[PDB]
Structure 1
Amino acid sequence: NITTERAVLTLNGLQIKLHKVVGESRDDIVAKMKDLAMDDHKFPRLPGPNPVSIERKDFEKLKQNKYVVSEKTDGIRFMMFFTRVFGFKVCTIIDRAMTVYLLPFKNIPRVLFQGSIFDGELCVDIVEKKFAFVLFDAVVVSGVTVSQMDLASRFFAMKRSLKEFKNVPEDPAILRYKEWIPLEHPTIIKDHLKKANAIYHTDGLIIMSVDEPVIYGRNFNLFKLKPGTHHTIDFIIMSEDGTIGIFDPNLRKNVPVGKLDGYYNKGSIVECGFADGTWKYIQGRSDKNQANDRLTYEKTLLNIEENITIDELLDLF
């Protein structure tokens, strides 16, 4: 059988009970995905890109090349993976740390089970108060490697495979498709970004290359933008007086980086925002025991300083 364990994910006030696939069953699915996606990176990872924050330096690049833009859905990143394990057709969703859950839909076409790797976001539809799975892109469709084709081709492949799929009310996530809008259509982007934020929780915008193949991992040419200056970091309290630290993952030592005004419990993780020269407390995170790492800190500082906005960026076009 596939060894399961149950688990519940909470997003936006709503929760989904999923079977987390465990042990050797998890390991087989992962290995299957690694094969299908032809990924020979020695460290386990989803076959899809992780964005970089836009910087002022990239504005040139965007002006020379072709790019699409979309809302940055706030949810959990999942690679959706159709396959067969032990002869059985299995629809998995796998997260960035390579945690597998089954997510079953009644009417998935059997072609999909020849091997389909789609990328997306499990998220909540605000209007409907149900979960949605929003597809960004496809890497392999019905055994056919689509990743080296350009974006429209991949969507053409993905949308073809699902042409006959209909979601039934008892399915756990409504499947939906990211509507990608060309960066040279600002009025079409804004409207799309207005209508999108009626259905979903977003965290800005994603800007993606119209034609490059799929990148697995950090994609220096996939840019995210956070609306305005509202970036945060998690520090660890290194002293009861609020010396905040940031984690150096290769020292595995927390480095003293600032101080907060207040009394704090040493060892706690505080989410802080920058304002007027200092970090300010926003919320304590009882769910974390680790601060963010130096690179996220060094990068977030640059972002705060650059203060790119959605309106600057949308005005460039």
Structure 2
Amino acid sequence: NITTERAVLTLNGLQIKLHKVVGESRDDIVAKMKDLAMDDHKFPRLPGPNPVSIERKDFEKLKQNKYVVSEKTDGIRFMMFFTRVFGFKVCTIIDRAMTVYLLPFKNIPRVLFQGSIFDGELCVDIVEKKFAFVLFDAVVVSGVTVSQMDLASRFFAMKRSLKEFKNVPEDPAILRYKEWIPLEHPTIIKDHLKKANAIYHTDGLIIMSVDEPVIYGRNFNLFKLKPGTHHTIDFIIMSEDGTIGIFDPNLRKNVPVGKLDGYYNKGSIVECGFADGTWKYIQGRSDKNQANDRLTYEKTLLNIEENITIDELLDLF
């Protein structure tokens, strides 16, 4: 039976009240989304791509091939999944943790429930002070497995399925679509950004291929560019005195890599920022047990070094 507990999400000061599916219901809805998005990945994950941080080396590849660019909305990622379950026409949004919420809307055209997986962001519309779901991309429309098309194919695929659909005040989240600009349109992009920022919280640009089929996982060819004070690592407290370490797989240990200042609990996981030659404490992470691995530390440093800027991106092209 669809078994829901209540829940609330809170974003940028506002609260949404939704129905978390729990129990065998959560599992099926997830399982169904396995089978539709045809993901034979041993372990559970949204059928979605994960961005990676742009680094200098990338520009070459950006200069050659065809990419769109967009606002990195500051929101919660979620896979929107429309399905019928046991006779209930159901609209579910899925968190990265395979957490499932009913996000229902009046006007969802019956066909969507045939099997639609679109990929988008939950976030808060600064203007209405209302919630929105911005649609990035899409993987299956109404049974039509669109993963392998090109982006735009996918985007219109999405666009016209929801064409007749209209939003009603009562509805939980305004649907909207991500306006994806082509890289070679710098002036456009800037303005697009300065438009988007006025309505939503952003964290820089996302840079996606125009042409590759949907990627499930770490998508080394999905870029993020993120204003670089928001680069963090979770170290482990290796010493009362605040020596912090990181994990090194081939050596299999945690290795000291910095010293925080003062007095800290050994074996804590602490989220830290970098500035002025040094890492600084931000908050504890009781919720971890694992520092980041060496690579990540390396990469984030590399990244904090380069201080690649939005303009550096939107000037090359």
Q: CA deviation at 1:280?
A: 2.0
> Would you say the 8 A contact 1:229–1:307 is kept in 2?
no
Q: Offset of 1:272 from its aligned partner?
A: 2.1
Identify which range, 284-293 or 88-97, moves more after superposition.
284-293
TM-fit CA distance, 1:168 = 1.1
Secondary structure of the equivalent of 1:297?
A: helix
C-alpha contact 1:131 1:174 (8 A) present in aligned 2: yes
Q: Please say which of residues 244-253 and 194-203 is displaced more in the overlay.
A: 244-253
Go from structure 1 to structure 2 and tell me whether the alpha carbon gap of 1:61 and 1:263 turns closer, same or farther (over 3 Å shift).
same
Q: Deviations over 1:100-127 (max 9, x none)?
A: 1111111111110000000011111122
- What does the per-residue CA deviation read over 1:152-211, in whole Å, with 9 as the maximum and x for residues that have no partner? 111111000000111111111111110100100000000011111111111111001011
Against the structure 1 CA distance between its residues 112 and 204, is the aligned structure 2 distance closer, same or farther, given a 3 Å change threshold?
A: same
- TM-score scaled by length of structure 2: 0.93
Deviations 1:70-121 (A, max 9, x none): 0111111100000000111000011122111111111111110000000011
Distance 2:148 2:258 in 1: 45
CA distance in 2, matches of 1:125, 1:288: 31
Shift of 1:13: 1.4
- Separation in 1, partners of 2:5, 2:254: 34
Query: What displacement does 1:278 show?
Result: 1.8
CA distance in 2: counterparts of 1:57 and 1:37, whole angstroms: 32
How far the C-alpha of 1:296 sits from its partner, in A, is: 2.8
Deviation at 1:256, TM superposition (A): 2.9
Distance 2:214 2:123 in 1: 22
1:276 corresponds to:
276
**1:26 CA drift (Å):** 1.1
| Distance in 2 (alpha carbons) for counterparts of 1:69 and 1:31 | 32
Aligned residues: 317
Tell me whether 1:56 sits opposite 2:73 in the alignment.
no
Stretch moving more, 239-248 or 127-136: 239-248
In structure 2, relative to structure 1, the CA distance for the partners of 1:285 and 1:15 (3 Å cut) is farther
Aligned-partner Cα distance in 2 for 1:35–1:251: 39
> Structure 1 residues 104, 253: closer, same or farther in 2, change over 3 A?
farther
CA contact (8 A) 1:228 1:310 kept: no
The range that moved more, 222-231 or 105-114, is 222-231
Taking the aligned partners of 1:39 and 1:94, their CA distance within structure 2 comes to 15
Extract unaligned runs of 5+ from structure 2.
none
- Residues 251 and 134 of structure 1: is their aligned pair in 2 closer, same or farther, counting only changes over 3 Å? farther
Give distance in 1, aligned partners of 2:86 and 2:303. 48
Q: TM-score scaled to structure 1, two decimals?
A: 0.93
Q: Where does the alignment leave 5 or more consecutive residues of structure 1 unmatched?
A: none
Query: Is the CA contact 1:240–1:264 (under 8 Å) kept in the aligned structure 2?
Result: yes
C-alpha distance 285-29 of structure 1, shift in aligned 2 (>3 A): same
